Each structure stands twice: as C-alpha cells, then as structure tokens.
Amino acid sequence: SEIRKLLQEIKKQVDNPGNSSTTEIKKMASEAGIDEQTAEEIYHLLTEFYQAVEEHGGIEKYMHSNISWLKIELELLSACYQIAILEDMKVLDISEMLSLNDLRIFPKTPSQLQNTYYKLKKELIQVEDIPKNKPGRKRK
Amino acid sequence: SEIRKLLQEIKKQVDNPGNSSTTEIKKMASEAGIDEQTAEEIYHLLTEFYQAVEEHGGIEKYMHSNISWLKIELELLSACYQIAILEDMKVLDISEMLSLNDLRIFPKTPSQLQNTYYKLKKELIQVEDIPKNKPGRKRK
DNA sequence: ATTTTTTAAAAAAAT
DNA sequence: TATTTTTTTAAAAAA
C-alpha cells in the first residue's frame, strides 16, 4: 500500500498549500488506487486542525495547553485510522505512522493516539474538545 | 512573621537586579528579625536558578522540557522550606506560598513542591537534576 | 507533619 | 493482530 506516502504528501501540502494542492492529492490517490474522496476529506480535516492549532497559539502552546484533543483533531483521528485500515495497515503501525515518531500528522505519541482511538470506539469519550484532566485524589 | 513579604521582595529584586539589591534585602531581613545570611543565600540561589532556566530556553521551554527539577532548583527548595519553617510557617502554607498560586518562586504547583520536599527528606531523590520519568509499563 | 492512597494519562503487556 | 487490562509515574489530597 502507498497510504503512508499519500498521507505524508497530504501533510506536505497542508504545510505549504497552493492552488494545485488538492488536484495533486487526487492524482496521487488515484494512481495508488486509494479512495479519492476520503483522501481529500483528510486534507481538509488536516487543514482545519492546523488552523485551529494556530488559533490556540501554535503547536507548542497547544501541546501544553489544558486541551488534550480538539473536536476537529478527533474527527481527523477517526478518518486517518479508517482510511489506513481499509488500506490493510495494522493498528500498531497506524498509531506509529500518524505520530511524532513518523509523519507527525498529530502532535501525539503512538500511545496517545492508540489509547484515544479505542476510547473513541468504546464511546468512553465523545467527538468534542477533550480537556486534560488532572491526576490526584478527588476533594472530600 | 514577615517571611512571605521578604521572599516576595527577594524575587522582585532577582527579576530586576540593581547594585543595591542585596543591601535592600539585608535591611528588610534585619528589620523583620529574619536571619540575614539565609536571606542572602536564597537571593543568590534564586538568581542562579533563574539564570539556569534562561540557559534552558526560558520558563515556558523549561516547564515542558524533559527535566523535572534542576540541581540548583532543589537546593533553592531546601533553603526556602528551611527558612520558612524557622519563621514558624506550616508546611501546607509554605508549599502554597512558594508555588504558582502565590509568589511563584518556583514554576511548580503546591503539590509538586510538597511531594518533592518529602522525597528529598526521605532521601528517595538526590540533590541533582531530576529527569521527568515517563509513566507506563516497563518493556518486557 | 509525614505517609499513603487515589486518580488520570501514558506505555506496553495481556488477552 | 485487534482490543482490553495492567502497570508505572506524577500529581492531588486524604489518611
């Protein structure tokens, strides 16, 4: 599968967009036999996510803010795992690929991505901003 | 006791030092009946700590780096609790006073300060740089 | 005043 | 290999 190189190029375009960005992504997806619609959806979700990060002061300011995940970030997470799974990638490999260890689609580690993916599937969390909850005993 | 206002003024001077800084601190300590030597020691330890933070990219860069505590920061911690205890302050009050909730001598919460103080006293940790250890199971 | 327990997240083993 | 549970660490607050 060429899903990794496609996602990599999608991020490359989001980080430096031009009037031919989406056309190039469609072409790359087509040549790889990857669904064009889902490829473009990811490009647009990623664009929004990065725009949101900037509205939150930037990647560094965001990674340390009180927000663990943004609603758009979770939408992106679900779309990324879904397209990669359809392309026959193993879960462990997807978590690695999307993380800080590789493509850096998300400013998250493979475990942050994978634990969240399963909580999302188990409906332990909703598709909405998720605040960083503090540890420690609860007040009396 | 006037230990809180003394520490506050010590930090005020460290944040904007002049040729009369230490003289003013000595005077304030004297008028409050607080040991002058320990007051000056704290001024110098605090100065070093803030210089170290700057060498580590700044307060924001440091609070998120892989270092939990700096050696000089622990030396400062011990000196601050010691002088405050001698001035009859309760432990809970000291942790609050030195923290982000009040004087901000340290870029730490009252619990980070208090838990570390006791680990230091119990010799569970040494007076040296302490790295931020990651959570999670240990590898097989 | 000092120690222990609890919680939440992250990491990786267990299933 | 997909999903769940356990473990560890730090932080928060009870014990």
List the CATH number of the domain containing A75: 1.20.120.1030
For residue A130, being part of any structural domain is answered with no
Q: How far apart are CA A20 and CA A24, in angstroms?
A: 6
- A114-122 CB contacts, 8 Å cutoff, 24+ apart: A116/A69, A116/A74, A116/A77, A117/A77, A117/A78, A117/A81, A117/A91, A120/A74, A120/A77, A120/A78
CB A10 within 8 A of CB A39: yes
* C-beta atoms of B111 and A64 within 8 A: no
Sign of the CA dihedral with A108 first, then A109, A111, and A114 last: positive
Q: How was this structure determined?
A: X-ray
> Which nucleotides in chain C have some atom under 7 angstroms from a protein Cβ?
1-14
CB B45 within 8 A of CB B76: yes
Q: How far apart are CA A106 and CA A108, in angstroms?
A: 5
CB A105 within 8 A of CB A46: yes
For residue B38, being part of any structural domain is answered with yes
Resolution in A: 1.8
Q: How far apart are CA A133 and CA A90, in angstroms?
A: 30
For residue B80, being part of any structural domain is answered with yes
CB A116 within 8 A of CB A128: no
DSSP, collapsed to helix, strand or coil, labels residue A102 as coil
The total domain count for chain B is: 1
DSSP B69: E
Name the residue type at position B128: E
The chain B residue lying nearest A135, using CA atoms, is B111
A window 116-135: Cβ near strand D (< 7 A): 118, 121-122, 134-135
As a dihedral over the C-alpha atoms of residue A20, residue A24, residue A25, residue A28, rounded to 10 degrees, the angle is 180
State which residues form the domain around B90: 1-122
For residue B7, being part of any structural domain is answered with yes
* C-beta atoms of B136 and A64 within 8 A: no
Report chain A residues whose CB lies below 8 A from the CB of B136.
111
Closest CA to A79 of A31, A39, A116, A27: A39
End-to-end Cα, chain B, rounded Å:
54
- B17-25 CB contacts, 8 Å cutoff, 24+ apart: B17/B47
The chain A residue lying nearest B62, using CA atoms, is A64
CA angle B92, B8, B110 (to 5 degrees): 25
For residue A139, being part of any structural domain is answered with no
For residue A12, being part of any structural domain is answered with yes
* C-beta atoms of A136 and B64 within 8 A: no
